Write a protein that binds this ligand. Structure first.
Ligand SMILES: CCCCCCCCCCCCCCCCCC(=O)OC[C@H](COP(=O)([O-])OCC(O)COP(=O)([O-])OC[C@@H](COC(=O)CCCCCCCCCCCCCCCCC)OC(=O)CCCCCCCCCCCCCCCCC)OC(=O)CCCCCCCCCCCCCCCCC
Ligand SMILES: CCCCCCCCCCCCCCCCCC(=O)OC[C@H](COP(=O)(O)OCCN)OC(=O)CCCCCCCCCCCCCCCCC
Ligand SMILES: CCCCCCCCCCCCCCCCCC(=O)OC[C@H](COP(=O)(O)OCCN)OC(=O)CCCCCCCCCCCCCCCCC
Ligand SMILES: CCCCCCCCCCCCCCCCCC(=O)OC[C@H](COP(=O)(O)OCCN)OC(=O)CCCCCCCCCCCCCCCCC
Ligand SMILES: CCCCCCCCCCCCCCCCCC(=O)O[C@@H](COC(=O)CCCCCCCCCCCCCCC)COP(=O)(O)OC[C@H](O)CO
Ligand SMILES: Nc1nc2c(ncn2[C@@H]2O[C@H](COP(=O)(O)OP(=O)(O)OP(=O)(O)O)[C@@H](O)[C@H]2O)c(=O)[nH]1
Lengths: 320, 55, 347, 37, 99, 139, 98, 459, 120
């Protein structure tokens, strides 16, 4: 069976499979800093498990067929309409932040779960600790309401506390004049009007709290735009640390068993993201929720438990 | 006056009010261990006492 | 806790309870209660959160106090008769003394203030152990000494427990508090009939037990800790709320939903003993338990409640727990009313 | 469509104590995760 | 926008889709079949053969039997001349009066 | 049950002063028990406030018992029938009215007459017939 | 029943009352706890020796060796409640209001 | 009786095993078939109940009531596929399951030989009715109604429980037969009075009796249409059925310990019918009408008179058929206008010509127009009550006067008058609504020809 | 009650002297009732695990009814035992203490005087 209490009793450990390539290396920074491209190179050369930026459609990406579901069936919030209208009365602003943080948290569990079951380090774009900077900046510009800031906090406090912090964060320090020049190079029809003040408020939010917070919990390795392009230098940089700070170095098989218990169960990881705090942006009434759930249930695969859907061709269902 | 003022207040509302009124007191314990044990001490004392739980 | 450590810990808790039910010597009885307490505390202190530390401290203080208060009652029995067997005690003071000590460990009389709080702080899974398995050993001893019990004291313990059980549960929102107050009310129901018939106490024990795991482990599967958090379960798991509602209806004791079987037989047995005001009062105030039972049933399945946007995420993934013994517990706690003449099996 | 409870209905059932009083007005609902040389 | 709830639904006029709709179901063919089978096992099967069944049930309360024995009693008790109806039913000879 | 035995020993509708005396002792002791519990579960301020709450609860309970004791006995004297449960009923309502005076609310006093009046009739009801609230194990 | 026999009995009653009401300190509460077993150990000892219960002399030592399991677990709980809250003061155990 | 219970139980898989849209058809046709088998029991032998086994028995009292329940079962099914069609397959499947579990308990209740077996199923009808009222009820207050309904009848039923078990240990057996043959005179001791109160109060609450009647205006106003009729058409009669059955051991304590109930009922009918003279809500108007007619049966039963009993059962079933029907009338108009107020929808005879008729002889049957068995029921009670006391007619006669004024009043306000100007969504009435009305009217007037099949055992 | 019956060996589910009773028939209505309970549990089981209620785990459905029907038969024998045991020592006490079981006089209603209460 999967990792259970029986397996640990009969031999299944975690420290035996742990090795040097067991570092959580989160790449973070300003919008349009090439951190995503740099993360691929770091994971490629180090042999680390890369993790692409978990968007609105990451949860459906991880389960089912991985194909994106309809926005009504997943998220009910689009970064496209987000950028188009700042203060939409439908509350696409905060609803996106809560859903995106949920995908970041889900991605974090996949990193730890895969790391503990295989022993290969992980690199992820942004992080569950890299998601508060946006909402804080989103609050300063009035992109959300004040209670959105509060509701995001207990969701973090109830959830983010349980998981372990990373070891060496990767920062691509890119100034405002560069990313204002960089955004127009792509030409997608929702990023061409990103308010410069928004990207301005992203970086100083990183300055004041982001680096200082994890400095006591992990090493911080900053890089400029030039210092990030040469991925050869940073590779040796991250291989010359100690990661003594944070609770990660002190980790016996006792705590490992509990952590693998929670990440292998893909319900408790995201259980508290639905904390019953009724906010207008994120609360869905009974009628709308019921109709969408019927739409979700009638979809293939989700009708029954996985491996129990005759509509896809599951044979031997009478004896499974 | 008769149907949905008095007859709904004689039986239903009076019982509902009494149950709620006695509910707000019996469930509003202060959580302090001192008063809990002191409440036991009365119960232990008086139980072996004036109710004559010996004859 | 390492699973091997935890498994052996549970194992001695069961052994401690088992020793109580199979020991003729009074001293061995106190040993079984001592071992049960000795290993109950670490199970509560598994999550290691301040509420758990609060709950364990309260549980230990009241249980240890009753444990040695129990030991004092045995010595007085030795002081007045020189015996050690559990047949019928020989000193009226010791009768009340141990009845108080035994009862406090069940949390029914004014000696019950720990029960709502101790289950609140500790986790739900360990709560199942506290309100199901830790309630057989003291009941086992009480059945053995039911001959010498003092009816005046014991029935006063029953009335207060049912009255406080219903009244306390009306004002609570934390569903853990709901369960404990319901458990106290059920405890008063079973505890009233020991002077009359021990067999009916046993039947009330199994039915109440199966009902508690049915409710508790369903609550485990839903992963909810408040009424509001339980409300959202309809969106993710509509089925769970469907059986959870029928368990609540049975928990009230509405026929033909089994759970009315103990209340029915308890009323009948006391009625044979010319006690007829007593059955009526407990039966009348049994409706108090139904009110918060319906209230919990109302905002879980009967009426859908405003869910959350992130709840759509939960639909994609599936439960990993194999919910062992959950299905047959629901059926055994909801449909066994026609199979009532199995009372003879207990005798 | 039939009536369905709204957020106001939930808040009526959502307090720490369903029957509030001045003796319980200051009370606060428990944290959701129970965590308080 | 308060809550993300669906707007009030619009009442569906069954005659709008099919003018010959019959209020038993949206789908016409089974809508037609529901009528034929509700009327059949209802207006006809139970309301007619059921009605004559209860109407033609054998003697209820033994009414006819009560009449037939009745005149035999009167014809007997009018022929002899003793009163056709005694005041007391149970024979006082068979009874034991206390004291 | 010596305190209750005082009430039982005095036959109804005779020797009213002692009948009231027994009722006062029953009321005062009952008021003392609840007052002690209230002090315990809800600790008040400095002891003078504690005895002040004790003074209220005992005085209310003693007053309820006293007036109930008088009415239940003097009425049986006037109406020349001691077995009638109505004797306790008026006394039950009479005692219920005092609670409204002590609590300073007509509604609470009206409710007490409605309920305590009925229960007092029921308490006398069992005494006449022979009801056992706490029946010993018989079968 | 001799004068001394109930000199222990009241001592148990005084120890029980001392444990049944807390003044300010959990250690002092614990002190009344094993004080109660001391009288319990004591009271049993007179009974067994007086009655010449030649085989019951087992019971006292195991009464102590098992009351220790309570005590050992007892302070070990307090050390937990006195390192999060810092103080063994028992009025800080009201965090479980709701 | 297993020829009825077994097919009813086997119909439960029948619905759940059915296809997507065939659930309504199969459930309706087989329930109608079950009704036909129920009519096989109308023949009651001379003076003996049709005792089938120790578990189940039937006499002329439950014989009309049983077939009323089975006949009802299609009618809720025929009255439900309007608002239920906009729902998932499971929830519609669940709804049918509940009513069938409802009738199954009702079938078992009326046929039960043992008072305890009577008792268990008698309260058990709460469980399906409660969920039906709460789940699919189309209102907000229904949540309070469910509590009001459940506790009120249970608050009387629980004291009943202690009464039966006391009889079992004292008298011996508790079945309907031995009690009748071994009946003994009940003394006047105050304990016997309380047993009389316990053995009676549970049945009066479900009638209801005036004062203990506030759970009808709550439940009926916002219950679902299907659940509204059964609760109105039989569940009230369920309290009635126990009244004849259990008043076999309460003699002669009935004579003295009935005056408060007779005074509460004989005055309540005037008061409750005076309610009906003015109601803003049509469904509330019908619910209070059921209180008055049921209050007649309480008077009928409590006198304990041969003529009174036959009038009681005749009115009991007759009221149920017409009260259920009038509730269907409310559902139709409420469906078109999406409201319950009287004056909102008016002058509906012009818009809907046939419904003007259906609501018309529905009112006449509610009016006890002779020879409709509503008259043969009410008129019998007057004669029995008048023999009991000559002043009963002053009150009970005045009921028929008050019953007329409000009965036509809803006919005047809704059907007659001028059409409402703004209302324009009233389409032609579907044949389902018209048929359902006929399924009620025709058996009523058809049964007028043979009242002997409704006059009960005392006939 | 039987508690300490003279010869009740402990921890004995179905004592060997209970075999003198007629064993319950395989098609007993009580016995098959909990075969339903096993079946009724079967639908519940896969329902929680989100599986086709009727057609899924036919082996699981077979186990639930078979396990229920097995433990039921032995439980039913125990049920018949004690009730028969309850009746056995019952009658034995009657002819062991005849003084507490007098025979009431069989006097027909011809002499019995039951007062009649008219109802008007
Ligand atoms: C009468 C009719 C009704 C009753 C019928 C009888 C059955 C009653 C119980 C039904 C099932 C209950 C249940 O499991 O609910 C789920 C519920 C939650 O399960 P969960 O979510 O997996 O969490 C449990 C642990 O926290 C998970 O912790 P973990 O992740 O470390 O996993 C440990 C787990 C999984 O097992 C292991 O890890 C295996 C350990 C192997 C190493 C040890 C080997 C040596 C011992 C072998 C023993 C065999 O093992 C245990 O928890 C150990 C205790 C249970 C088994 C051993 C007992 C004797 C020695 O179970 C519990 O909480 C267990 C409570 C203790 C047992 C039940 C107590 C309640 C009933 C008492 C009355 C019984 C009737 C009396 C008459
Ligand atoms: C005692 C009185 C009654 C007490 C109990 C009352 C129960 C109903 C009311 C409960 C109270 C709350 C109100 C209802 C809430 C329902 C919430 C719910 O979960 O509804 C939706 C849910 C979805 O079900 P789903 O997962 O889609 O599976 C369908 C079947 N595949 O729906 C479901 O999960 C329902 C699925 C139904 C499956 C039943 C299967 C039955 C199979 C029968 C086989 C018969 C074979 C016969 C053979 C004859 C020959 C031998
Ligand atoms: C025939 C023999 C007997 C003859 C004498 C008659 C009987 C005894 C006297 C009457 C006893 C019943 C009447 C009530 C007595 C207690 C009254 C009392 O405690 O009042 C204080 C208080 C009520 O006021 P409170 O809610 O605090 O609001 C104000 C706050 N500032 O109280 C409370 O807040 C708490 C709720 C009330 C106290 C608990 C219940 C007390 C009564 C229990 C039953 C007593 C039965 C006595 C007789 C039988 C036994 C001997
Ligand atoms: C048998 C003993 C039962 C003890 C139960 C203790 C908890 C419940 C009682 C309680 O806390 O309050 C009830 C009673 C009167 O409380 P009161 O003075 O009215 O103040 C209420 C608002 N704080 O306060 C009490 O302490 C009275 C409890 C016993 C009543 C008899
Ligand atoms: C909402 C309140 C209730 C609504 C109204 C319900 C009906 C009113 C009466 C309720 C009576 C319930 C208890 C009756 C049990 C069965 C009665 C019975 O069998 O008769 C006995 C009547 O005897 C009784 O004492 C019965 C109880 C009398 C009333 C006292 C208790 C009931 C009222 C209080 C509890 C119920 C109200 C709810 C309170 C929250 C005869 O026994 P006996 O007294 O002759 O026995 C032999 C010997 O004399 C010793 O007993
Ligand atoms: N809310 C939220 N959005 C995020 C987070 N991380 C990334 N995004 C979104 O990811 C999208 C792409 O980010 P960009 O920085 O523009 O991506 P890029 O141009 O590839 O540049 P790099 O991120 O530097 O690789 C934007 O919509 C961001 O808001 C996060 O933690 N929270």
């Amino acid at each position: 069976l999967q990792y259970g209490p029986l397996a640990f009793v009969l031999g299944e450990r975690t420290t035996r499979k742990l090795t040097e390539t067991s570092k959580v290396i989160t790449v973070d920074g300003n919008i349009c800093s090439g951190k995503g491209r740099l993360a691929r190179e770091i994971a490629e050369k180090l042999g680390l498990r890369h993790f692409p930026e978990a968007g609105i459609h990451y949860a459906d990406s991880t389960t089912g067929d991985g194909k994106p579901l309809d926005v009504q069936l997943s998220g009910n919030c689009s970064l496209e309409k987000f950028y188009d209208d700042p203060k939409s009365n439908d509350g696409n602003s905060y609803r996106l932040q809560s859903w995106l943080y949920a995908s970041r948290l889900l991605q974090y569990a996949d990193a730890l779960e895969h790391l503990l079951s295989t022993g290969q380090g992980v690199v992820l774009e942004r992080s569950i600790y890299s998601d508060f900077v946006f909402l804080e900046a989103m609050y300063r510009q009035g992109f959300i309401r004040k209670q959105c800031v509060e509701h995001y906090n207990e969701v973090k406090k109830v959830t983010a506390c349980e998981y372990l912090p990373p070891h060496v964060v990767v920062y691509v320090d890119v100034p405002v004049p560069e990313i204002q020049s960089r955004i127009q190079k792509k030409g997608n029809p929702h990023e061409m009007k990103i308010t410069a003040a928004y990207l301005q408020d992203i970086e100083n939010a990183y300055k004041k709290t982001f680096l200082p917070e994890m400095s006591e919990k992990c090493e911080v390795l900053q890089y400029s735009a030039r210092e990030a392009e040469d991925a050869e230098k940073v590779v040796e940089d991250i291989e010359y640390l100690k990661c003594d700070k944070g609770p990660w170095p002190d980790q016996d098989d006792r705590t490992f068993h509990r952590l693998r218990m929670l990440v292998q169960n893909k319900l408790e990881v995201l259980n508290y993201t639905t904390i019953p705090v009724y906010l207008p942006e994120i609360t869905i009434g009974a009628h709308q929720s019921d109709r969408v759930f019927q739409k979700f249930t009638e979809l293939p695969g989700r009708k029954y438990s996985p491996g129990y859907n005759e509509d896809v061709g599951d044979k031997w269902i009478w004896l499974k | 006056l008769l149907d949905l003022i008095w007859l709904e207040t004689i039986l239903p509302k009076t019982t509902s009010f009494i149950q709620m009124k006695m509910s707000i007191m019996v469930s509003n314990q202060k959580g302090l261990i001192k008063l809990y044990f002191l409440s036991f001490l009365i119960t232990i004392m008086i139980s072996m006492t004036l109710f004559n739980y010996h004859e | 806790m390492n699973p091997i450590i935890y498994t052996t810990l549970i194992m001695t808790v069961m052994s401690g309870t088992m020793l109580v039910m199979i020991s003729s010597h009074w001293l061995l009885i106190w040993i079984g209660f001592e071992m049960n307490l000795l290993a109950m505390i670490p199970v509560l202190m598994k999550n290691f959160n301040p509420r758990a530390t609060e709950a364990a401290t309260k549980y230990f203080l009241t249980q240890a106090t009753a444990s040695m208060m129990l030991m004092m009652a045995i010595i007085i029995n030795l002081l007045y008769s020189g015996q050690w067997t559990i047949t019928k005690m020989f000193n009226p003071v010791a009768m009340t003394m141990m009845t108080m000590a035994l009862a406090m460990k069940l949390g029914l009389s004014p000696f019950h203030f720990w029960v709502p709080e101790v289950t609140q702080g500790i986790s739900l899974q360990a709560g199942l152990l506290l309100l199901t398995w830790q309630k057989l050993a003291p009941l086992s001893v009480l059945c053995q000494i039911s001959q010498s019990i003092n009816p005046n004291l014991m029935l006063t313990m029953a009335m207060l427990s049912i009255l406080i059980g219903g009244w306390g549960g009306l004002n609570q929102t934390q569903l853990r508090k709901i369960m404990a107050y319901s458990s106290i009310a059920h405890m008063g129901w079973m505890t009233a009939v020991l002077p009359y018939n021990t067999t009916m106490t046993i039947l009330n024990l199994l039915i109440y037990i199966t009902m508690t795991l049915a409710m508790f482990m369903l609550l485990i599967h839903s992963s909810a800790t408040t009424t509001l958090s339980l409300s959202h379960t309809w969106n993710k798991m509509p089925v769970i709320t469907s059986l959870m509602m029928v368990t609540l209806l049975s928990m009230g004791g509405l026929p033909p939903l089994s759970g009315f079987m103990p209340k029915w037989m308890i009323i009948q047995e006391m009625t044979k003993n010319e006690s007829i005001i007593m059955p009526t009062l407990m039966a009348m105030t049994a409706l108090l338990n139904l009110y918060f039972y319906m209230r919990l049933a109302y905002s879980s399945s009967l009426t859908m409640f405003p869910s959350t946007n992130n709840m759509k995420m939960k639909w994609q993934f599936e439960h990993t727990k194999q919910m062992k013994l959950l299905p047959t517990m629901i059926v055994l706690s909801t449909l066994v009313l026609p199979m009532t003449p199995a009372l003879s099996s207990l005798n | 469509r039939q009536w369905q409870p709204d957020v106001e209905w939930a808040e009526q059932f959502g307090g720490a104590v369903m029957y509030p009083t001045k003796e319980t007005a200051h009370w606060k609902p428990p944290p959701w995760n129970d965590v308080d040389v | 926008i308060r809550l993300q709830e669906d707007p009030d639904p619009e009442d569906e006029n069954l005659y709008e889709k099919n003018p010959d709709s019959h209020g038993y179901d949206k789908d016409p063919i089974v809508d037609l079949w529901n009528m034929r089978v509700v009327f059949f096992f209802g207006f006809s099967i139970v309301l007619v053969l059921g009605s004559t069944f209860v109407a033609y049930l054998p003697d209820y309360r033994m009414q006819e039997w009560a009449r037939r024995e009745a005149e035999r009693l009167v014809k007997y008790r009018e022929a002899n001349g003793l009163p056709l109806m005694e005041s007391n039913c149970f024979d006082p000879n068979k009874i034991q009066l206390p004291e | 049950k010596t305190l209750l035995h005082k009430y039982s020993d005095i036959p109804e509708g005779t020797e009213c002063h002692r009948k009231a005396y027994a009722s006062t002792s029953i009321g005062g002791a009952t008021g003392l028990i609840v007052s002690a519990y209230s002090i315990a579960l809800k600790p008040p301020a400095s002891f003078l406030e504690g005895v002040a709450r004790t003074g209220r609860y005992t005085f209310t309970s003693a007053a309820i018992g006293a007036i109930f004791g008088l009415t239940s006995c003097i009425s049986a004297q006037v109406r020349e029938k001691p077995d009638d449960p109505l004797n306790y009923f008026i006394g039950g309502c009479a005692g219920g009215l005092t609670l409204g005076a002590r609590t300073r609310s007509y509604g609470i006093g009206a409710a007490a007459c409605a309920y305590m009046g009925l229960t007092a009739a029921l308490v006398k009801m069992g005494q006449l017939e022979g009801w056992q609230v706490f029946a010993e194990p018989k079968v | 029943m001799p004068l001394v026999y109930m000199n222990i009995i009241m001592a148990f009653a005084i120890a029980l009352a001392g444990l049944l009401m807390y003044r300010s300190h959990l250690m002092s509460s614990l002190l009344c706890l094993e004080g109660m077993m001391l009288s319990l150990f004591i009271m049993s000892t007179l009974i067994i020796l007086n009655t010449h219960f030649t085989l019951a002399n087992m019971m006292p030592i195991i009464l102590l060796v098992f009351a220790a399991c309570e005590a050992a677990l007892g302070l070990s709980l307090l050390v937990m409640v006195s390192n999060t809250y810092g103080t063994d003061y028992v009025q800080n155990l009201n965090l479980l209001q709701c | 009786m297993l020829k009825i219970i077994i097919p009813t139980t086997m119909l439960l898989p029948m619905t759940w095993m059915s296809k997507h849209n065939m659930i309504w058809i199969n459930a309706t046709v087989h329930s109608l078939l079950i009704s036909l088998i129920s009519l096989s029991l109308l023949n009651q032998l001379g003076e003996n109940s049709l005792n089938f086994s120790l578990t189940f028995f039937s006499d002329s009292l439950s014989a009309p009531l049983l077939v009323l329940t089975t006949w009802l079962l299609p009618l809720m099914l025929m009255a439900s596929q309007s608002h239920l069609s906009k729902e998932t397959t499971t929830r519609k499947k669940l709804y049918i399951t509940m009513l069938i579990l409802l009738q199954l308990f009702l079938i078992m209740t009326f046929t039960a030989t043992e008072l305890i077996l009577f008792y268990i199923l008698f309260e058990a009808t709460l469980v399906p009715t409660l969920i039906i009222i709460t789940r699919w009820g189309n209102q907000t207050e229904r949540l309070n109604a469910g509590l009001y309904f459940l506790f009120y009848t249970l608050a009387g039923s629980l004291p009943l429980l202690v009464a039966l078990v006391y009889i079992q240990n004292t008298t011996g057996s508790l079945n309907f037969l031995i009690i009748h043959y071994w009946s003994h005179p009940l003394s006047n001791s105050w304990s016997n009075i309380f047993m009389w109160l316990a053995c009676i109060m549970a049945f009066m609450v479900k009638m209801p009796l005036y004062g203990l009647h506030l759970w009808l205006p709550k439940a009926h106003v916002e219950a679902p249409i299907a659940g509204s009729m059964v609760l109105a058409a039989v569940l009230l009669k369920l309290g009635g059925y126990g009244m004849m059955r259990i008043t076999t051991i309460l003699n002669p304590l009935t004579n003295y310990m009935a005056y408060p109930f007779l005074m509460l009922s004989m005055w309540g009918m005037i008061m409750t019918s005076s309610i009906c003279l003015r109601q803003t809500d049509l469904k509330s108007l019908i619910a209070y009408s059921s209180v008055s007619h049921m209050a007649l049966v309480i008077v009928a039963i409590m006198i304990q008179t041969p003529w009174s009993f036959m009038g009681a059962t005749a009115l009991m079933i007759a009221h149920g058929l017409t009260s259920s029907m009038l509730f269907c009338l409310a559902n139709t108009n409420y469906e078109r206008v999406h409201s319950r107020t009287m004056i909102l929808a008016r002058g509906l005879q012009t818009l809907l010509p046939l419904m003007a008729t259906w609501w018309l002889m529905a009112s006449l049957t509610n009016l006890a127009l002779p020879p409709s068995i509503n008259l043969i029921g009410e008129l019998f009670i007057i004669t029995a009550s008048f023999s009991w006391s000559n002043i009963t007619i002053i009150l009970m006669g005045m009921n028929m006067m008050i019953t007329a004024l409000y009965s036509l009043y809803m006919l005047i306000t809704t059907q007659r008058g001028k059409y409402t100007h703004h209302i324009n969504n009233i389409k032609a009435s579907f044949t389902r609504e018209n048929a359902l009305m006929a399924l009620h009217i025709l058996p009523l007037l058809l049964l007028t020809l043979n009242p002997k099949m409704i006059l009960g055992p005392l006939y | 009650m039987m508690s300490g019956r003279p010869g009740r060996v402990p921890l004995q589910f179905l004592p060997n002297e209970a075999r003198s009773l007629p064993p319950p028939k395989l098609t007993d209505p009580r016995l098959v009732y909990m075969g339903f309970l096993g079946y009724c549990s079967g639908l519940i089981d896969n329902a929680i695990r989100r599986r086709p209620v009727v057609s899924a785990g036919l082996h699981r459905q077979l186990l639930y009814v078979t396990s229920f029907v097995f433990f039921g038969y032995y439980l039913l024998k125990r049920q018949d035992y004690m009730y028969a045991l309850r009746d056995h020592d019952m009658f034995a006490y009657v002819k062991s203490h005849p003084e507490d079981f007098p025979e009431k006089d069989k006097k027909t209603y011809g002499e019995i005087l039951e007062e009649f209460h008219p109802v008007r």
